[PDB]
Design an enzyme around this catalytic site. Structure first.
Site, PDB file in Angstrom:
ATOM      1  CG  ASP A   1      48.127-113.102 -54.330  1.00 31.08           C
ATOM      2  OD1 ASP A   1      48.051-112.921 -55.566  1.00 31.08           O
ATOM      3  OD2 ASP A   1      48.570-112.251 -53.530  1.00 31.08           O
ATOM      4  CB  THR A   2      47.530-116.584 -59.399  1.00 27.03           C
ATOM      5  OG1 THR A   2      46.826-115.407 -59.839  1.00 27.03           O
ATOM      6  CG2 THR A   2      46.546-117.748 -59.128  1.00 27.03           C
ATOM      7  N   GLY A   3      49.250-114.010 -58.026  1.00 24.91           N
ATOM      8  CA  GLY A   3      50.254-112.952 -58.180  1.00 24.91           C
ATOM      9  C   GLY A   3      51.396-112.944 -57.173  1.00 24.91           C
TER      10      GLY A   3
END
Lengths: 99, 99
Positions: free
Chosen positions: B25-27
């Site tokens: 999850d880059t967020g």
């Protein structure tokens, strides 16, 4: 381009004739934008994550350019604290995770 | 690997000797796992997401193996909807976004 992850992966997008900053988010199924008064038909939706659910407006077939790469799809509008580009548009720009 | 985003980027991780599934999850700034026991001291912390804020347990300097790649860092444990590997560990395994 290649975006490292030392900081939040924020990029410029264009949507509804506006330029905005948005977070490239591989953990998001959908694209969720902070409150804006887009024209067009919409339907209500509830989306969840950490903390629970929020109510959003679902707009379909909305053109969105992400760092010069054109995309078109569903955008959710509501009280998110940050503009989030999810997988629905990341796939259209050929975004991959690599390690 | 190169991971495309037509499906959720779910991978197997090893943590505290146990296998789990988690989303890359880059967020997410932080790595947040569903309720589980981990060895050692923890500190109470609060984090926020799209729905609001939650209480979590912060474990520092925890070894985590992610698709065979080693990380050692902070792991938060609490009522997240899905196990997420956030940037704090994604950076350790050399993950980037590319399009």
């Amino acid at each position: 381009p290649q975006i490292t992850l030392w900081k939040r992966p924020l990029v410029t997008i264009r949507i509804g004739g506006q330029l905005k900053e948005a977070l490239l988010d591989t953990g998001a199924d959908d694209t969720v934008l902070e409150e804006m008064n887009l024209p067009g038909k919409w339907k209500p939706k509830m989306i969840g994550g950490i903390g629970g659910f929020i109510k959003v407006r679902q707009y379909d077939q909305i053109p969105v350019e992400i760092c010069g790469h054109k995309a078109i799809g569903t955008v959710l509008v509501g009280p998110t604290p940050v503009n989030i580009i999810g997988r629905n548009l990341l796939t259209q720009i050929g975004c991959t995770l690599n390690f």
